[PDB]
Ligand binder design. Structure first.
Ligand SMILES: [Ca+2]
Length: 265
């Protein structure tokens, strides 16, 4: 069992803010949160409204998912009552950027995954790099938009198939087939899955020769989004063992949140 990355955010020593994006950035903070299931646990929070948040970290080791499972599993919370804001992550190959601080919204990524909320639109992104900066998308499931943590899980299997789960419950599965349309570079994934259908099937869409970095690059209107925990592994049993710990801690979190609301406004 090979764990390629497990960030619990005791600190963000590994994560480097971008110097290359040209955008107005805000600072991340390591915080407990307004409600939590473990008083010694902490998370990565966006601290300032109407700013971008752009940083990247190196994985524990460079790897390829050829002929292997890949599990991307992370716990994300919109504690602020989100009106418009991203909450997703990106995985990047070694050649995308010379070092962490070169990461920008335009850098080449292998995979973009996670929730994204704005103006009524609420989607879980699953974007797969196809060729160059062209990506594939399909019609996407809703994401959660309340104020407690939710575990997002993406499983990529080497028969070119995938599974999407929220809080340990399957919400979508399939093969990377003509359900998916091709997105042009820089074009928005609006969640409908409707773009350019004119591209040849790749039986190796699932596979990337290099995973080396992970990056966060989100716009925030109301800031306060918390990235609690990030796991990258090739081992389904290890992913399930860590999910159990996190889901039990999210249950205690929710009970603290319900007890606070029951006493307040
Ligand atoms: Ca944590």
């Amino acid at each position: 069992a090979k764990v390629y990355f497990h960030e619990t955010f005791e600190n963000r020593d590994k994560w480097i803010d971008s110097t290359s994006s040209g955008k107005a950035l805000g600072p991340f903070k390591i915080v407990s949160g307004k409600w939590y299931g473990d008083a010694n646990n902490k998370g990565l929070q966006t601290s300032e409204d109407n700013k971008f948040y752009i940083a990247a970290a190196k994985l524990d080791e460079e790897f390829s998912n050829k002929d292997k499972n890949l599990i991307v599993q992370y716990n994300l919370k919109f504690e602020q009552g989100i009106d418009c804001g991203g909450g997703y992550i990106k995985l990047l190959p070694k050649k995308s950027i010379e070092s962490e601080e070169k990461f920008t919204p335009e850098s080449e990524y292998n995979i973009m995954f996670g929730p994204d909320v704005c103006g009524g639109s609420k989607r879980t992104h699953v974007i797969m790099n196809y060729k160059g900066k062209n990506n594939l998308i399909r019609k996407e499931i809703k994401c959660e938009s309340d104020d407690i943590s939710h575990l997002y899980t993406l499983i990529i299997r080497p028969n070119n198939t995938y599974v999407v789960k929220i809080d340990g419950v399957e919400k979508q599965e399939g093969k990377f087939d003509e359900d998916w349309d091709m997105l042009a570079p820089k074009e928005i994934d609006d969640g409908s899955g409707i773009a350019n259908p004119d591209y040849v099937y790749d039986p190796e869409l699932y596979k990337y020769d290099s995973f080396a970095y992970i990056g966060i690059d989100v716009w925030q209107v109301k800031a306060g989004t918390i990235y609690d925990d990030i796991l990258i592994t090739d081992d389904i049993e290890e992913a399930e063992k860590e999910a159990k710990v996190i889901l039990e801690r999210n249950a205690a979190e929710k009970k603290m949140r319900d007890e606070i609301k029951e006493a307040e406004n």
